[PDB]
Amino acid sequence: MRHGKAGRKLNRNSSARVALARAQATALLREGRIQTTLTKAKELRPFVEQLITTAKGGDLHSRRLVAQDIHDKDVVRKVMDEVAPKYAERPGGYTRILRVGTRRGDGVTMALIELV
Template structure:
């Protein structure tokens, strides 16, 4: 299988990743479960690669995924120029131990 289902149907999963990606781009660092962090990492790499192109078509493609205009603006104006020379490996994942409520393994994902 090419992706993780995370116990959700496709529309819930799509909404979840839109939300996580938007907040990740706004704050450049979030705390989530390890599996979500690993999945978000690949999505972020694709978005940054699109943003590095910098044209209108790429902006519309990113906006179709994120929906949040503020996050899209930050991605194109601040984040993409920082990684202009970098080919990949835009994120770093730290494991931070189990969550108190359900002992799910937590991680912090941040931009390098």
């Protein structure tokens, strides 16, 4: 049974679940938009949304919080001093997804997730 849910196991253990959502947040932040499986995108959406909301605070604490997950110093810098400040007057919804059909090899359906 499962009448309350944090998201997905994907098909991975606690350690990986994390390492993935971290890496994919890092790439969407470095890259503005990326396409991946529709699932992994839906799973990415709130992690990265909350991450930008953390960095939106400006003080050293929020930067060190972001450093906890985005372990590449330049992406954290960009999110801190570039992207979050831009999202200043935006109350969430930093992120959007749109779906782009189906893949050849596994016949899986990819989609794009991009900064708003």
